[PDB]
């Protein structure tokens, strides 16, 4: 009972020290001042189970745990977003918003960070293949929308990505046909003019479109369709007119 | 034969309802309680003997 | 003194007999967890004492006991509602305090403050034919009966939500004089069931007009079967300090009757029937003693009880000893919830032996126990002829069995169709009762008065 | 320490016994066997030996444990087959080249050569620290959540010592706990009872969904994971085919496996078909094998083991539910944990119940029935989990009026009735709506209904379209086939493409009878949507047969449901169906003049 | 020391630490006589073990105590088939000792020889519709049911003089070419009955090949009930030592159920209800743990367990107990013996589990659960058409239902019908339901594919 609401405030305090280290967040902070004030005091163990059996210390460990699964909610989605970072502002207006809400476990915000953590976790043991680049740049565009829009509003580019990285990881690895397809669809269906200028490198552009070109080459029995596909094969970006300049050809 | 089949048709088919009805209930809940008695009922004396 | 063995929830300890019976004791353990206990048997160098929170786990040198010197008494307090807690004693999930400034004894007969006199008033619950075919008023104990397949929880609180919100318009109607309170008491059920009746309860209601009870599948018969002690004491200390009515639900009854049931054969006792301890209805009659109304003429305590067939026959002596020692019998049916009617309480084998007591002659017309009795008997007499109707159908039926077929259709259809929270009254449900049974003709309702039913033909 | 007093048939009898509970594991005589003590009376303390008692003489000594008999909780616990004691089969394969565990011979719940990788976790020095919390990780799956290393239950204080990153063994001391001074060493693996239950921070009702690959599951009732429902079983002719293709068909993180009283040849079955049949996600390197846990117990087990396996696949389930994700537990059956009680209650001398069955019977299963389910997970993360329990009921006196499975079905919530002629038919699963129920069906059709659900009116719609279709076949077999309107025959056609589609569906196959939730939503709107464009148009005047004719691809479309694959560029979205609503309403435009 | 009492057939000897569990004692008397037993429960300062040779006649201050200094096994070789041997363990072929040099325990296998695996080759019994409809794969349980008006012990000779035979002709069609045992225990039979089994198995040629266990009914229930036990461990030990199919025939269980029922009012645990001991399961358990295939893939341990009812009622625990460890169960019907039929067994009560993975390959065919489901369908509408003939009369029953009445009396009279020395196979069985279902046309069976149909028509 105690143990549990002492050990909630210490890593509420562990999780507030590394949410913010320069005090940035002062609204997020400032709601944590009953839990992180008996944090800053050297103090043994039996001193916080007693001061928090006798109604001196922080209480309520189930509801203290329901505003806590919230906080590490916002930690791990504030966590999850690297190497990019969000807005002070925007991640204060998400804390609140999050923290203003009934329930934050039965709705998709929850599942969308656990399937957006489970993409990530993915990403960490892999090998060099095209579902895993176009998994990593769908979660690092994803990722960047994610950083960029918050987790409070709803945009289809993220629901697109979040889709076609789990439709992406549910496939086995003899699905390039499929993963080929679903790449072009998603990048002839993404508004903007480049997805992957700005975050991913340019050696992981070169390597996808040397990885379309030498996937579609192999299809072709022409010199001059193989050399004018081949000559493509050098670029460092990725765009749409690169697509359809290599549909055309084949 | 008509008029024969079709008189037996609705005694046939009263009785095959009532049959299927008013057969199984009975000695169904007599037996599962006169098997639950006999149950607790053979039970408690060799309860009582081992006690 | 320490304990010498331990068999299943009881714990024998070796002591000497200096202790009372009755008297509180505590097992300490090396896990860092203190146990409380009763002391059922006292010996020279021995002694039986049954632990109320945990039933494994105890050292025989390894663990002491202490006596605290205090006689098994629950403090009841005024400040119990708004409160979670379970019932052991204590709060074990280190909710609100169950301190209190009273205290009351759990042993039966505290201060004697059942009724001497019969009541006269009339309860509502929402239910037509509950309010109508049972006759239920203050002060008056009634069982629902339920079984393995259909929703008896969500019935069961589907009629508190109901009864909730039905007092109200009754005491606005001038159906009572006080205040209304909730004793809810909940003994060997799950999280999720009542998660969903917490829920119910505070979607149709409030938090503070109720009681939080609560006990745990994964601890001991004796720990749960402490629950209704501190529950009748705190409804019956709260009906008598402030002169309000108060609604206990007793749920379920299934495992107060398979704890006690549950420890008797690990003694030195002999059993009754279906293994069940020959001392049951002592045990299920000290619990249905304490109902009826209160000191003072303001008071009374309504017993709601809700109990589960564990093997649905008619054979079990918890049915059979629960519905002869209440004063009220209600059965739910299976075939009625399966054809769609919610709630599917059946009036069939319904019948209670205080209609006359518990029918209102003050706040409701004198005409609803003759309307309830010839509605009662025209629906078994429409059973009857939907009995016919099943045998044979169109081949024997006469003019009489399709008259009560219809009236059994339009009643069963009529009277038994409701929603989840909306309530009735007793003079909607003469009316509605009274329409019912106008389609009946003249000859076949010989059974009631000519002045009566002249007036509503 | 103790002495054999006594050794008459399988429980023997050990005076000179003092400081022992009522779980306390100890090993009798000098073979070391297994055992329990079940009760003490006296200075004597009666224990029941799960091994063979041959060979074993009063006055050998008995040498306890100092601790109740429970089994480890760590990394390693999934891909390996145990016993219900926490014995693993697997390891003495190997060795003694055996299929159980032989006399005088006990083997750890944890091997000692097996190692894994320790990370850290977000704690460090100086900070405070509770039961559940996340002081480490490991990784050991990359389809699935991985096996975090969690801080021990009933255990608090601060962190003096933290591991750091790197390789080491189970048995190694790799985390240490400051309180009362020197308190205790730490280690990878953690002790705790399987009579207790677990820590946990709050128990709610069952609002969190999960894939489950059943349509007729998630097309007669809302999917959930946290729920407490009871099946019929069939004995091994159809259960086992129902529980491999749940478990196999379903999408979860973690699966438990407890075999009670099966006969041996379900368990060799679904492990050998575990490893040799992918997962539904497609998963490598033992998808089906490492995500899920093996517990099987023949029948010619202990009765101790066989009781204790419930026990220990709802404390893993209880584990993986603590560790934040959400897993299946599937156990066959409840009639042989009761028959194993009433066993070793008539071994052990005690009064039983009518029917050979005790009044502990119902306490173990409300406390097994309310011991699993979905909540928050406990500790200083506050993660989310679920544990649904699925237990098969089977008799076990010779009829349904028994008071295990009468018993069984009063504490369970929810109900599924298996029919046996759909199952003789090789058709699986097959759940009658008419005998089916559920009372989580208002709170998962509100929040799955919360977003865009179309569950409640397709799931009414279908069970009152079979409800209404064994009625219109009862009336057609009773009165005749020229009796009914074109409306019967619409519903029957309805009822018929509904029932041959979900209640028609196979076990045996892999992308014929697994399908998301949005898949079977439209299929069932889709053929919703059709019963009423048909009765719509029928309404308007219209014959049967022109409307049948009418009508063409629209019935071959939504009748060849069941089977095309799901993947059509996403695991829900389907084109295919959308196409089919404008289909039809172009059909039932053209139909109606 | 010297004896304490006797009450009854366990007998109180004075001994404290000397005897083992299981451990065989001898009793030195001063009348000439000796007389041997095993320690069945051993206590501190006591000892109650009972004697199998005689149930009385010992002294109280006149006995003597003797260590033999081995437990009580079963002596597993390869010369134990062929002779002629007691239940307890010793022969009585009058000859030399028949020992080997492997000793098993008779509680169970140390080796852990439990199957892990499901069953793929099917093994045959000497039966057409045994084998067609019933048949059971390697290490697969399947009981027959029986009672108290049919011959049950000589359908079990049968079926072990029966057996034996179709492994040369299945070795020469390439299938199961190994080495095949037979494993014979006896509990509770007469002289008559060993003497005409070890007679009507010596003429066949089977009984060298195969064990003899006699148990009568005159000896002790601990011989009886550790009759099995020998067998089970010598087929077990010869399974896994040889890597050969043993089949175990284990008739009957009423007499080692009522030998353990009468063994359970003699120790101090309580029996069950019926009063039959409530620790049956484990019992049946024990016996039932040594079966499946043995390790090594080219091994199993097959038994076949008969069981006697009194009126073939399934409200005793036995058969509930029993048919539930078991994967399915086959009746016999008391109408077929009565009518002729040799063995009459009916396939609509009985049921196999796993029946469509139970066949092996190289030595069935693949249409033998495709004919067994035409020829089940067509013998359960043969018997619903045998029913309603003679309701419906021989001017108004259907067109199928004569064929399938005909095919009912031929199929029953032909494939079930057999002689008691008549050896079959798959083939013979397979060939002998396609020439009684040739009598059907081919638009009245839907069960089987059209090749394997219009060329075996």
Sequence with gaps: YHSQVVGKIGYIARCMQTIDPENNLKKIREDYQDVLIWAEKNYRFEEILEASKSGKCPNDLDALSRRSLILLELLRLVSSISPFKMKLDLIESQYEKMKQHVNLWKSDYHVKLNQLNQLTDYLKNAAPTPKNNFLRAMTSVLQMQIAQYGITEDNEGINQLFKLGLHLLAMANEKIDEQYHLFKGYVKDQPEESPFEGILPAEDQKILVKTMIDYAMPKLSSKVLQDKLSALSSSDVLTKTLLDSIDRIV | AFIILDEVIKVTNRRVNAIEHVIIPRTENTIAYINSELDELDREEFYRLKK | NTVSGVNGPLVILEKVKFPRYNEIVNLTLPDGTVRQGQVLEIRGDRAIVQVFEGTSGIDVKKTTVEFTGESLRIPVSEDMLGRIFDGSGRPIDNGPKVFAEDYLDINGSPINPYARIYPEEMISTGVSAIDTMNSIARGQKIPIFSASGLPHNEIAAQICRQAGLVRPTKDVHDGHEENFSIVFAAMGVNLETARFFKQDFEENGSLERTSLFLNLANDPTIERIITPRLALTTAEYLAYQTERHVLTILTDMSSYADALREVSAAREEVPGRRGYPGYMYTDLSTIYERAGRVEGRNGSITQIPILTMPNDDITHPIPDLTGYITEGQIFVDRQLHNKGIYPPINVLPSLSRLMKSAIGEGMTRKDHGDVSNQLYAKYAIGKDAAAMKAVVGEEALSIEDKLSLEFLEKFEKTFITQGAYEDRTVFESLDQAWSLLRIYPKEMLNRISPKILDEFY | ?593
């Design chain 4, 1 to 593: 320490y103790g002495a054999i007093y006594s050794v008459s048939g399988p429980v023997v009898i050990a005076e000179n016994m003092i400081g022992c509970a009522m779980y306390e594991l100890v090993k009798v005589g000098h073979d070391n066997l297994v055992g329990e003590v079940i009760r003490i009376d006296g200075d004597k303390a009666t224990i029941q030996v799960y091994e063979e008692t041959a060979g074993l003489t009063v006055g050998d000594p008995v040498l306890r444990t100092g601790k109740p008999l429970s089994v480890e909780l760590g990394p390693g616990l999934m891909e390996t087959i145990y016993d219900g004691i926490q014995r693993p089969l697997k390891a003495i394969k190997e060795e003694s080249q055996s299929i159980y565990i032989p006399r005088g011979i006990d083997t750890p719940a944890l091997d000692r050569t097996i190692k894994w990788q320790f990370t850290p976790g977000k704690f460090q020095v100086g900070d405070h620290i509770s039961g559940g919390d996340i002081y480490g990780s490991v990784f050991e799956n990359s389809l699935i959540s991985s096996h975090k290393i969690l801080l021990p239950p009933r255990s608090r204080g601060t962190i003096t010592w933290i591991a750091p990153a790197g390789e080491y063994t189970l048995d190694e001391k790799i985390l240490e706990v400051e309180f009362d001074g020197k308190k205790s060493d730490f280690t990878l693996y953690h002790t705790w009872p399987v009579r207790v239950p677990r820590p946990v921070t709050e128990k709610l009702s069952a609002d969190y969904p999960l894939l489950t690959g059943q349509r007729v599951l998630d097309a007669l009732f809302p999917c959930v994971q946290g729920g407490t429902t009871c099946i019929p079983g069939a004995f091994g002719c159809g259960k086992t085919v129902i529980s491999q293709s749940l478990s196999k068909y379903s999408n979860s993180d973690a699966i438990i496996y407890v075999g009670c009283g099966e006969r041996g040849n379900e368990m060799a079955e679904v492990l050998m078909e575990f490893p040799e049949l992918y997962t539904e996600m497609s998963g490598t390197k033992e998808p089906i094998m490492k995500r899920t846990t093996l517990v099987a117990n023949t029948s010619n087990m202990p009765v101790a083991a066989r009781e204790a396996s419930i026990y220990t696949g709802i404390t893993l389930a209880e584990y993986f539910r603590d560790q934040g994700k959400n897993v299946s537990m599937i156990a066959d059956s409840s009639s042989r944990w009761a028959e194993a009680l009433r066993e070793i209650s008539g071994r052990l001398g005690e009064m039983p119940a009518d029917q050979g069955f005790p009044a502990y019977l119902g306490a173990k299963l409300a406390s097994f029935y309310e011991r699993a389910g979905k909540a928050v997970a406990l500790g200083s993360p506050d993660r989310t989990g679920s544990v649904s329990i699925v237990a098969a009921v089977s008799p076990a006196g010779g009829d349904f009026s028994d008071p295990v499975t009468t018993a069984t079905l009063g504490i369970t919530q929810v109900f599924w009735g298996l029919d046996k002629k759909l199952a003789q038919r090789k058709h699986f699963p097959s759940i009658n709506t008419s005998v089916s129920y559920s009372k989580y069906t208002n709170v998962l059709n509100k929040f799955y209904d919360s977003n865009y659900p179309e569950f409640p009116v397709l799931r009414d719609r279908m069970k009152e379209i079979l409800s209404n279709a064994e009625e219109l076949e009862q009336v057609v077999q009773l009165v005749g086939k020229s009796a009914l309107s074109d409306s019967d025959k619409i519903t029957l056609d309805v009822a018929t493409l509904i029932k041959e589609d979900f209640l028609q569906q196979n076990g045996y196959s892999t992308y014929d009878a697994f399908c998301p939730i949005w898949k079977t939503f439209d299929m069932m709107r889709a053929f919703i949507s059709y019963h009423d464009e048909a009765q719509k148009a029928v309404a308007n005047g219209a014959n049967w047969s022109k409307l049948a004719d009418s009508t063409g691809d629209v019935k071959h479309a939504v009748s060849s449901s069941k089977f095309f694959e799901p993947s059509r560029g996403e695991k829900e979205v389907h084109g295919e169906f959308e196409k089919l609503l404008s289909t039809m309403q172009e059909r039932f435009a053209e139909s109606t003049d």
